[PDB]
């Protein structure tokens, strides 16, 4: 999934 | 100056139970955003990604280690515990913790990410032997 | 997963010379990538974060550049504690990966 910080 | 340093059992058998622990100063797990994680590098190989918590409480893990590991934060003792379950040979490796930026904030505002991406303080490392 | 795969994995190089560690990404990782030396039997220490800045304390020689799929670590003149190992990190998507390390040794 996204990082913590991603869109 | 933020420092780190691992701590634990430097051999366990076969099947075991390893719990190693990372204690820092100069920040705390309860500042804005902030994360530490674990990565592992077997003597000889590359580094290995392993998970990660942040002062939020949020936890991820490696997918080919979910099922054995378990991180936790103590904010209060400055410490993150990562326990791995059944640990075998391959599992040999010198372990880090590492500290993870949380976004620039200006003025309680965040208008920064650019600084979370890295672990930018890592603490000595410690080796663990799996040999029955 | 997303993998990184560092080139050359091994370069060999002397004092003053000019060298560029490339990282190339499966899929987009925005900017979010980052470089470190490691040193034999020390821990990695952090060069560059967010694809090109320069972490604080780390000299100027360094430099990173690029975003999405490619990028690069470029020392522009090597001193001798340069002779070591280098990974980029991907912190886009979980896991968190690291490319397999490309160790600059002493030419002859």
């Known amino acids: 999934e996204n990082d913590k910080w991603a869109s | 100056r933020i420092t780190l340093k691992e701590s634990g059992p430097p051999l366990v058998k076969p099947t075991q139970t390893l719990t190693l622990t990372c204690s820092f100063s100069?920040?705390?797990?309860?500042?804005?955003?902030?994360?530490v994680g674990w990565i592992r590098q077997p003597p000889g190989k590359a580094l290995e990604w392993l998970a990660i918590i942040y002062s939020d409480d949020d936890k991820r893990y490696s997918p080919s280690l979910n099922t054995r590991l378990t991180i936790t934060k103590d904010t209060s003792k400055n410490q993150v515990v990562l326990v791995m379950t059944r640990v075998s040979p391959v599992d040999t490796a010198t372990y880090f913790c590492?500290?993870?930026?949380?976004?620039?904030?200006?003025?309680?505002?965040?208008?920064?990410?650019?600084?979370?991406?890295?672990?930018?303080?890592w603490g000595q490392g410690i080796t663990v032997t799996i040999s029955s | 997963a997303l993998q990184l795969t560092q080139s050359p994995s091994s370069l060999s190089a002397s004092v003053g010379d000019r060298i560029t560690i490339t990282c190339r990404a499966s899929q987009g990782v925005t900017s979010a990538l980052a470089w470190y030396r490691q040193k034999p039997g020390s821990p990695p220490q952090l060069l560059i974060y967010d694809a090109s800045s320069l972490e604080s304390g780390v000299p100027s020689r360094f430099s990173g550049s690029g975003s999405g799929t490619e990028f690069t670590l470029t020392i522009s003149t090597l001193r001798p504690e340069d002779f070591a190992t280098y990974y980029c990190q991907q912190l886009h998507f979980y896991p968190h990966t690291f490319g397999g390390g490309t160790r600059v040794d002493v030419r002859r």
């Open positions: 590492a500290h993870r930026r949380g976004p620039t904030t200006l003025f309680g505002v965040p208008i920064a990410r650019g600084p979370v991406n890295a672990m930018d303080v």
């Open positions: 100069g920040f705390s797990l309860s500042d804005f955003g902030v994360g």
